[PDB]
């Protein structure tokens, strides 16, 4: 009736319903080897240098910080 | 409870669409 | 109509008298429906909702 | 991890298509990588518009994968071959011992005889 | 009050129906070791066995913990008392704790209670922990009996049990789970009453 | 909500449709999400065995799906611009930032794509004539989720490795796209998935 | 079985494998539904037959009958509702039957004491069964699985507390009376034995 609980009448019963409520219930080392080739890139970009204006000197500077990074990496 | 309900709503839900095992390494 | 009654509510005879939405492996139960949300929502909480009268809202 | 999976989308069988490259594979991998593509794609073969069979998403008087005509598992397991035409699958020696000795090319009783040349490899 | 108690439990069909009916009087805190004294007197005074009062024991246990104090302190104390009881009582006490036991409606650290030697228990004691652990293997598996036994967070509490040490004691306590009919258990006392 | 749907299921009932109809418990849809990062560098191939695909996804950070969700940076911004935004508010290297390359399971969806390959830039040009059907891949995988089917949100998915046949074309054409999904999905289940 | 046995009160058979001496199984029983029909109709006979009978008598067919069913059955009645429900509407319908054998049905007027009452002293002798509560769960959960209890209704109406015993709790259950009659007549045979050997 009330809830899912209970009967449709009380009247064809010898009750009067009440329902109620019940007490008792209870209740990676390539990811590495990545990131230091990432890191190695990363330096190699932190070059940049887009100031002095340089063309293919910019790139042998690169290669030659390159160069030095790996030497320091061995 | 808590620990339980993203297994629960996991279970409940490639039930009710898929398939109910799930691989981790199932395409590879 | 749909023979179900608060508690401070009356009581009536009811009018009228396998599904796989009652499977239990496949229903989410945090709070259970109760008969106070059949009352309020009565097309979306009821199979078979007959001579239904749709309450006011809020004022 | 069997071959009763789909090859290009790597699930299992719901709605299965066989193609006339010997490959089947699933109808939407079928339909939306290769809605103008043209071509096989599990060896880059071509394949031609009316080259595709179906084999699901329909009705069917088996109820399951299995052999349409010797009602046993013709699954991927087992040598399953599947006729072009009608677009049954059975079993490819249950078939061929079928329409070899007595011609039974149609079914076990809905009757439906073909010819013995339309059948072809499933996978 | 224990003629109330009575009368619920009489009244009552159903364990479910006698715990909620027990409940429904809201007995006050200073009553609920007089509650469980005669739950245990209720059932001591049936013919047999009977699985209702081990059931409604288990849900008190399992509904509030001051039950389960209460049950504890009331295990310990009709230990203590054995030989004042009859040995139709003794069996229906007994094996209202088996089954407080293998539910896990209470602790195992009530057995650090029972000291298996000759000299310090009765006889009556002894009729009681061979009632108790037959049960014991029997409503719950030997290999399972012998796991809960085995476990390194309860072996302070079954020492009095096991002794492992005064090897007369120890040849006691093996002979006796043995004549029992149980074997097994003794297996690792075996061992090391074997190694010295 | 519980009136929408309210109003929905009294307009079936009684308007466009007269047939008694059964009526389910109401639940939500759950989205896929990752915590940790791809602890195993998982990869996969292409049926012609010749390209490999090797990818691990991470997490993104917290102001960065609700961004993508309300337009603040779209696809069609420069890409200067894109990496301005990323670098001035997210820190981001300017490696990293140049290195997105597609949106989510739809356009604007909650999912970034990074490329950083580093033995595969000497084939770049290669590697943007797949990026096109890598991003399908992409989003076909995010869409559609390996856990519960549901949609993959708040994942940087970042690219470690592409070997590309060299003039692909007839392997290069349609097959990258389901080898792309079953990338995804790999480094997706290896990155501790929660719902 | 997942997770562990179901301890459940009485209709739980634990079946004891003889050589482990170990409980393997177990047995869950309920009334067969042509038990339910046979008592209904027993108590539809004496509903009929009450038309030339006194009151004393009309209580003696319902205690036989009471006890008949009761005793057969014992542990598998408390897991068949429907029978508690058969039980409550039979026990009510001879009260009333009682009733209509004078011109009246006020319940002010019978209260159970003069039903209730031993007919040593004066009653009628009237065995109880009607007033315990019935349990109750969901409905929607009653024909999938067994969800515990979670509520309790009224089985007959009663002055506050009362508290009518129970029959079921004079009878001694079926499991408990195998096991003790096993017991008694292996020491009865080992007694036997002592007496022979001794020529005591």
Redesign the interface.
Known sequence: MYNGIGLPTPRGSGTNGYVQRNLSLVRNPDILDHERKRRVELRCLELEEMMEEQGYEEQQIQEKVATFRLMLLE | PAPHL?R???I????????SE?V????? | ALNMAIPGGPKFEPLVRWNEFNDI????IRQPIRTEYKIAFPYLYNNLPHHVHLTWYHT | LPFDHCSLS?Q?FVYPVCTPDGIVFDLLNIVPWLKKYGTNPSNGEKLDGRSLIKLNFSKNSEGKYHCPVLFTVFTNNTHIVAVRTTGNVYAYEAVEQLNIKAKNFRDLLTDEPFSRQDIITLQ | FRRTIYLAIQSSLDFEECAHKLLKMEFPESQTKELCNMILDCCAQQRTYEKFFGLLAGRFCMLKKEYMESFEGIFKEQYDTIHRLETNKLRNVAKMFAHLLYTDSLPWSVLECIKLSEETTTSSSRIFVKIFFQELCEYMGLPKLNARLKDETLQPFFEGLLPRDNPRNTRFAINFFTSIGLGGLTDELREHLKNT | GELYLDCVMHDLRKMYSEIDIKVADP?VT?CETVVETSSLK???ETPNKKNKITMIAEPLEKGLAEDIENEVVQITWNRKKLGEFFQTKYDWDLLAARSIWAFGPDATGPNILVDDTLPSEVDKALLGSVKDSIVQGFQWGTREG?????LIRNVKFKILDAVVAQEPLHRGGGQIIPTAR?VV??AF??ATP?? | TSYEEFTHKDGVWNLQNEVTKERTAQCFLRVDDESMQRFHNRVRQILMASGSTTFTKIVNKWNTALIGLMTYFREAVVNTQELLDLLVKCENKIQTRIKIGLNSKMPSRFPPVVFYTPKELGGLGMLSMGHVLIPQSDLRWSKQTDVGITHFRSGMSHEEDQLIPNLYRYIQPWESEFIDSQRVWAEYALKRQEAIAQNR
């Open positions: 993203a629960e709503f996991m409940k839900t490639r039930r009710r669409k898929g398939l799930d981790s390494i199932s395409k590879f | 492996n496949k229903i989410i | 790597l299992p | 639940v759950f998982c990869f996969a390996p856990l519960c089917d549901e079953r999905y790999s289940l290896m929660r719902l």
